[PDB]
Amino acid sequence: DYFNGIYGFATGIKDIMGMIFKTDTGNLTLDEILKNQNLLNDISGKLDGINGDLGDLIAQGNLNSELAKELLKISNEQNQMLNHVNAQLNAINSTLNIYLPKITSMLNEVMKQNHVLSLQIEFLSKQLQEISDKLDNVLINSTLTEITPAYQRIKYVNEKFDELTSTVEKNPKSYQDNVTKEVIENLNELTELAKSVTKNDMDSFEFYLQTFHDVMTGNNLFGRSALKTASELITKENVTTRGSEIGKVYNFLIVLTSLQAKAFLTLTACRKLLGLTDIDYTQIMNHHIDGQKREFRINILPTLSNNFSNPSYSKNRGSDIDDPIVVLEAAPGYALIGFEILNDPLPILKGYQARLKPNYQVDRESMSETIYGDIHKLFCPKQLEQKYYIKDIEFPEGYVITKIVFEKRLNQLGYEVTANFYDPSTGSIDLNKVKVESSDEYSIIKAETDGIYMPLGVVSETFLTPIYGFGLTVDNAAITLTGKSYLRESLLETDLLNNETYLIASPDGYISSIVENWNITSDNTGSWRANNNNAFVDKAGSSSLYTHKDGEFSQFIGNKLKPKTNYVIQYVIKGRPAIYLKNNKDTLFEDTKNNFSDFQTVTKKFNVNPSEIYFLFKNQSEYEAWGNNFIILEIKSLEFLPQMLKPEDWIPSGNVQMKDGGRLEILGDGYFKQFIKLENDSTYHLRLSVKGTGRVSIIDESKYLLFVNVKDEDLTRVIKNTSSKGECFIALEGTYVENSSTIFSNVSIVKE
Amino acid sequence: DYFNGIYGFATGIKDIMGMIFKTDTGGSNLTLDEILKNQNLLNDISGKLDGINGDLGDLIAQGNLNSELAKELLKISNEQNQMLNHVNAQLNAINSTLNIYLPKITSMLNEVMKQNHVLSLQIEFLSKQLQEISDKLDLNVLINSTLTEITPAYQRIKYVNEKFDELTSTVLNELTELAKSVTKNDMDSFEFYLQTFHDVMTGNNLFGRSALKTASELITKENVTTRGSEIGKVYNFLIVLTSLQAKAFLTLTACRKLLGLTDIDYTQIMNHHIDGQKREFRINILPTLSNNFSNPSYSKNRGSDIDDPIVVLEAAPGYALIGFEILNDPLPILKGYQARLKPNYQVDRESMSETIYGDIHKLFCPKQLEQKYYIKDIEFPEGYVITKIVFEKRLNQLGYEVTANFYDPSTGSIDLNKVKVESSEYSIIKAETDGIYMPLGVVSETFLTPIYGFGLTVDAANAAITLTGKSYLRESLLETDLLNNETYLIASPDGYISSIVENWNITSDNTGSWRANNNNAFVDKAGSSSLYTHKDGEFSQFIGNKLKPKTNYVIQYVIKGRPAIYLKNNKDTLFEDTKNNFSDFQTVTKKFNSGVNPSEIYFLFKNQSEYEAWGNNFIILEIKSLEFLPQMLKPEDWIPSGNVQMKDGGRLEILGDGYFKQFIKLENDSTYHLRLSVKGTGRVSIIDESKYLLFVNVDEDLTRVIKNTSSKGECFIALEGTYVENSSTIFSNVSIVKE
Q1: Which of A325, A710, B428, B574 would staple B567 via disulfide (CB 3.0–4.6 Å)?
Q2: Are residues B122 and B8 in contact, defined by beta-carbon separation less than 8 angstroms?
C-alpha cells in the first residue's frame, strides 16, 4: 500500500477540516442533564394543564375581584416555574433533536477519515522506535527543554480526542429514551476535552501548537531547529538502523508534521462541538507544515547522506572449499530496490525487485522477492582467511542497478554490478543503455574459531527506492554491504514541492507467497476452500482463518512446487492448530503439538515427487485454532563456479555407492577414482570434505603427486610445478574395515 | 541609522504606552464586556416589548369593545410605549458609545503597530548578530538549569508579542480573545510570566543565579570565535531580552485598552525591571568581560615572496579608526572603516567612510619561503584613540607601527598635537605548498567604536595569523546607556556601506540618479524595494566622472531573475553580466579594471533576451593598488637592446634576440637581495668590469643573495631570454634591495 507523503497527509487533513467546517449545528452550555428529559417533560405536562385550567377560570369572569387577584398571583408563581422548567426541557430537546444528529454523524465521519490517515503512517511508529532503542551539546539539550512540554500535550490531546470520538455513540437514537450512564459519559468526556482544548489562557493548546512550530523551524532565540538537532543525533549514530540519514530525518519530519496536522484537526473539531465561530486553520496549518519542509529541504537535507547499510551483524562460519556464485538479477522492466540478510530458517539473502514509477518511486503491484540460500558460504570462510575485493561501485545520475553478481573463488570474494539508464519523467528503464563495473585494492579477514560477523538485517532505504551505488566494506572481522539511494531526487520532485508522492515503506517481512490468498482480510477466502460451518473467518482486527471440531480449510498447490527443493513455511498462528502439506501417499510437512495464548509467527524450512500436494489448516485433537500470513517460498539453491572434476566422471570399485548431493560413500573395501590431467605451468587446488577416515591420493604413471590420510575434516592442498605423465587420476579411499562408512563430499580440483 | 540604546528602546515604548493611555474612547464607567452584555440584554427586552405593544395595539384597534375599557387599555399602551422608549434610550447610548469606541480603538491599534515597527527596526540588526553566536556553540548544568528555568516564561511572552503583532497588522474577535487571556487574573497569568522572567533575569530566585550571569559564562567559553568582544556579545543578549519585556508591557497596555479596563501606567514597573537588568549587568557581569576582539575566521592563501608591500590605514585629521574586514571577494581585500567621534567614544554616522586595500595576501602570507612576523601587543593609555596603522613587509619580514591621538570624551574632539607612536621578539611561519591561514572576517566591535589597543598574533602549530584590537565599548556603555543618558551606537556593518553609484540602495519610488526610459522599467516593492525591467526596459546612471583610469574596482549587486548588467560606452564594453538566471535574490561579487580611458562610461540595468529582472545594492568601489617600499632599480633606468619591449605593469618582454640592462653599484660591506619573476625561459646576470657577480638560468619566482661583493667598475644587471625567434620571455617584479 502507498504512503502519499506529507503533502498527502496534510491534504487528507484539510479535507476532514472542510467536512467539519461545513457541518451546521444551528445555544447550549452542554451541562444539561439529558437523563432528566422524562422528569422535566412530566412536570411540564402537569404544570401546563393546571395553569391552563386556572387560566380559563380567570378569563371566564364571574369572579370576585379580590379572589381573581390571588388566583392571578398563583398563576404567576405557577408560570415562573413552568417557564424555568421548559427552559431546561427546551435545551434537552434541542440537544437530542438538532445537535446530537449533526454532531454524531460529523464525529462518525471524522473517526472514519482519520482511521484512513492513521494507517498511511502506521508503518512509522515501528520504524521510528527502531531508532530511539539505538540512541545514547547545549543546542541539543535546549530543543528537548523547548519542545517536550508541547510534544507531550499535543500527542496526549490528539490520542485522547481520537480515542473518545471513536467510542462516543454515533446513533443519535441511542441518546434518547433509555440513554445509559456510559453513553452520556462518553459525550461529556468529549465536550470537556473540547472546552480545555479551546480555553484562552497562558497554557493554551494553540500556544503549544505555535511554540511546537517555532522550535521546528528554529524561530527560538538560538535559531536551532529541531530538524537540525535531530539530524545531528542521527548522523553521529554509534550503532545504526536501516535506511539512510535522509530517510531517518525525513521519517522524523513526517512524524512531527503529522502530529501538528492532527493538532489542527483536533482544534477544528473541538470548536464545532462547542459551537464557536468557524476558523479556517487550513491556511496556517499549511504555512507551518510548508515551513518545516522548506527548512528541511534547504538547511538540513543537502548535508545528509543517501548511503544505507546493514544495521546488524551475525557471527557465522562459512565454507573454505565452496566456490559460490550468487546472482541477483531483476527482470527486463524491473530494478533492484533492496535486500535483507536473515538467518531464521538458515543464512538467507532476500532480494526485492520491482518496476519503477516516475522520480524513482516504485510500482507497488509490480513487486517481487527472491530468496537465496546459504549466503554464509558466500560471505564467510571457516578455517582459512578470506580475501574481499573492495570497490565503491557508483554509476552516474539516471542509472538504476538491475543486476548484482557475487563470485567467491578459492576464498576470494568479488562482485560485478550492472545498471541500466532510467528516465524519471516516464519511469521507463532503457535496456540498451547499460553500464557495468566490477571489483588490486582489497581487504582480507582471518577466520576465527567462533565465526566472522556477516551482514544482517534489511539493506534498503526507509522508503523503497532504486539504487545507483553499491559496495562491500570490511573492518572487528565485520563485513558491511552499503548502497546509495535515489531518495533525495525522489523527495525533491514529489513531496518537497507538494506534488503527488507514492512511497512504499521498506517491508518488515515477506511480501509474497506461493499460497494464493495467503493474507486473509475479507470474508471471501478465494483459493482457500472450507468444508463445514466448523471452518469460518474470524475478524480478529486483521482477519484470521478459524477451525473447531473437525473444520478444515484446504488449498491445492501442486503445480507450484518443484521437486527436491527447499521451501520456507512461515505462518502466524493462535490456539492449538494442525498444519499439513499432505499427499494421499506421503506427508511433506506437519505442525501439531503447538499451543499459543496469542498470535505468534512460526518459521521453518521443508524439502522426491512433491507434486500434487494440497495444504491444510485444521485444529489438533478437538480444540480451536486461528492462523494466516501463510508464506511458502522457494529457497534458491546455492550455485558454484565450474571445476576440473565432473560428477559422472567418477569411477566406482568395490563396496562403494554414490548418494545424492555429490557424496561418495565407501561402504567397505572399495574406492572411487577420476582421471585428470595436470600441467607443469599451472597451480592447482585440491579441496574436499570427509566424514569418516580415509586417504586421498593423486597417482601417475611413475609417481604419487599427492598422498594424504584424512579424518572428518575439510582439506585444502596446493599443487605446483607438477606435470603428470600419461594416465593420471585422483583416488579416494577409506579404511578397509568392513561395516564402516567413509563419506567424501565437495571434492574439487581448480586451476588458479 | 543610529541604535539609541536600551534607554532609547524603553522610552520609545513608554511613549507609545502614553499615546494609548491618552486615547479617549467612549468614557463609559463600564468595561467592553459589560457594554456588549448590556447591549444584548437591552436589545432583547426591546425586541420583546415591541411585539407585546404590537399585540396589545392590535387588540385595541380591533374595536368592538367598551369605551371606558378601551381607555384603560390605551393608558396601559402609553405606559408600555414610554417603557420601550426609555429602554431604546439606554440601547441608543450603548450603540453610540460602541460607535465612538471601535473608531477610537482601530486607529489607536493601527498607530501602535506603526510606532512599534519603527522600534523593531532599531534592533533588527541583532537577530543576525545573535544568530552568528548560536551557529558557533557546542555544556554546563548551570547553563541547562537556567534554560529550564526561563524557557516557560520566554516562550509565552514571545508568543503573545508575535501573535499581538500578527493580529493588529490585519484589522477583531481573535484580538479581543488574546486580550482577555493576557489580562485574566489567575495564578498562571501573563503578569506572572512577565514577573518571573525578570526574577530569573536578575537572580531574585532563591539561589540567586541571574540568567545574565549564566548566559555570560556560555559566551566567554573561549570556543566562541565570532565578531565583537565579550562585552558586545553580552550587551547584545541584554538588549534582546530587555526589548522583549519592553514590548510585553506595551502589548499588555494595548490589550487593556481593547477590553476597556481602567488605564494602568505599566511604564514605572517596566522601567524598574529594565533598570534592574541594567544594574545587574553593570555591577555583576560587565567588569568580568573582555573588550578584546579578533578576526572570527581564517583563510588559506598564498602570498608573494618577492614583494615588499606597504599598507597604510590612516584616518583624516578629525577622524578615528573604527574597524576592519578582511574578505576573499574579487581578491584578498582589507577594508578599513573610519569616522569622526562623538562624545564618550560614540561614532558620527554621517561622517563615516570606508577604503578597500587590495592583495593583502602579498602582505600577510609568503609562498615558498618562511615569513617572519614581529609580534607586539600595542596598547595606548585611556583617552587615546588609534588614528593610523601602517604595515611594512620587507624581505618576508612583516612589521607594523600604530599611531594614536588624545581624545576628550566630554566634547569628542581628537587632539592632533598629543600623539603617541608604538611599533613592533617575533614568530616565524614556514610556507606550506597549500598556503597559510591569513585572518578573515570583520575585525571590529559589535557596535562600531574607536580603539586603544591593536596587535598581531601568530599560532605556530596551525600556521595562523590573528589581528586583535581593544575597544572602548565599556567606557561608552557606562556614560550613556547604563546611566539612562542619550546613546548613539552604530552596529558593525555586514557589508559595504558606500558605493560610487548614487542611489545604490533603492527604497522609495524616486530612483534619484537612476533614469528610467519606458514604463517597462519601474520600482517593485519586494519588501526591500528593487529595480525592475521587462521587454526592453532599462535604467541608466552616468558614472564616468567617478572612475579613474587603469584602476581595479569591485562590482557587487543583489539580483533576481535573468538580467543584463553593463558598464558600456559607445563602441566598447568595460564589464558585462548576462547569462545569469536566479529563482531568488543572490549577491554577486566580481572585480573589473577601468580602461586606458574609462571616462564617459555609464551604468545600465536591463534584462536578457526578453525576460524580467530585479536588482539593487549596486556597489562599485576603488580597490586601492598595493604600494611597495623603495628599491635600487628604477623602471626608466632600464636600457633596451634588440627585439624587446616594455609592457604595462613593470614587465620586460624579450621577443627574440634582444636584452635589457640597468647599471647598478654594489658595496663590499652590504648584503643585497635579487628577486624577480619570469614567465618563459631566460638568464639573469650581474656583470662587472672584470667578473660575473651573478649568473642564473631560469618559469619561476626567484630569490638570490649577494654578499661580500664590490663591483669593480661599470657593473649592471642584465635580463635575457633564449635567442629562439618567435618566442617570448616576460620578466616582472625585478628588484635588488640592500638589507
Answers
A1: B574
A2: yes
Q: Do B181 and A202 touch (CB under 8 A)?
A: yes
Q: What is the distance between the alpha carbons of residues B360 and B627, in angstroms, rounded to a whole number?
A: 11
Q: Which residue has the cell 493611555?
A: B21
For residue A517, how many other CB atoms are within 10 A of its CB? 17
Residue A370: strand, helix, or coil: strand
Sequence-distant (6+) residues with CB within 8 A of B221 are none
Contact B181 A203 (CB under 8 A): no
For the CA atoms of chain B, what is the radius of gyration?
37
Q: Which residues contact A211 (CB under 8 A, 6 or more apart)?
A: A146, A150, B155, B159
Query: d(Cα B203, Cα A207) in Å, to the nearest integer?
Result: 27
Do residues A566 and A636 make contact, with C-beta atoms less than 8 angstroms apart? no
Query: Three-state secondary structure along B53-88?
Result: HHHHHHHHCCCCCCHHHHHHHHHHHHHHHHHHHHHH
Cβ-nearest to A207 among B130, B144, B156: B156
Asked whether B694 and B704 are in contact (CB, 8 A), the reply is yes
Q: Please tell me the distance from the alpha carbon of residue B584 to that of residue B586, in angstroms, as a whole number.
A: 6
Who's near B272: CB < 8 A, 6+ residues apart? none
Chain B: give the shortest CA distance to residue A201, in Å: 5
> CA–CA separation, B188 vs B202, rounded Å?
21
Identify which of A703, A692, A683 has the alpha carbon closest to the alpha carbon of residue A732. A692
Burial B91-121 (b: 16+ CB within 10 A, else e): beebeebbeebeeebeebbeebbeebeebee
Torsion angle of the four alpha carbons A49, A55, A57, A62, in this order, in degrees rounded to the nearest 10 = 180
User: In terms of Cα–Cα distance, which of B308, B296, B324, B299 is closest to B454?
Assistant: B324
Q: Are B568 and B528 in contact (CB under 8 A)?
A: no
Largest CA distance in chain B: 158
Contact A722, A681 (CB under 8 A): no
Q: What single-letter DSSP state applies at residue A439?
A: -
The answer to whether the Cβ–Cβ distance between B180 and A203 falls below 8 Å is no
Using the structure block, give the residue that is written with the C-alpha cell 531517518: A248
Phi, psi dihedrals of residue A383, rounded to the nearest 5°? -135, -20
Paired residues of A673 in beta bridges:
A651, A731
β-pairing, B582-593 with B552-561? Answer: antiparallel
Q: What are phi and psi of A551, to 5 degrees?
A: -55, 130
For chain B, how are helix, strand and coil distributed in percent, rounded to 5?
A: 35, 35, 35
Q: Is the dihedral of CA B116, B117, B122, B124 positive or negative?
A: positive
Experimental method: X-ray
Locus of grid cell 562599485: B620
> What's the helix, strand, coil split of chain A in %, to 5?
35, 35, 35
CB B574 within 8 A of CB B601: yes
Report phi then psi at A232, rounded to 5.
-55, -55
What would the 3-class secondary structure string for A512-547 be? CCCCCCCCCCCCCCCCCEECCCCEEEECCCCCEEEE
* Cα distance between residue B568 and residue B576, in whole Å: 8
Rounded distance between C-alpha atoms, residue B383 and residue B620, angstroms: 36
A-chain residues near B130 (CB < 8 A): 221
Residues 6+ apart with CB under 8 A from A177: none
The DSSP letter of residue A405 is: E
Residue of A27, A206, A219, A221 to mutate when probing chain B, most B C-beta within 10 A: A221
Residue type, B511: T
Residue of A724, A647, A656, A730 lying closest to A687 (CA atoms): A730
DSSP code, position A3: B
Give the three-state DSSP class for A91.
Answer: helix
For residue A158, what is its C-alpha cell?
Answer: 490528539
* Cα distances (Å, whole numbers) of residue A553 to A556, A558, A579, A582, A602: 10, 16, 10, 13, 19
Nearest Cβ partner of B147 from A145, A149, A204?
A145
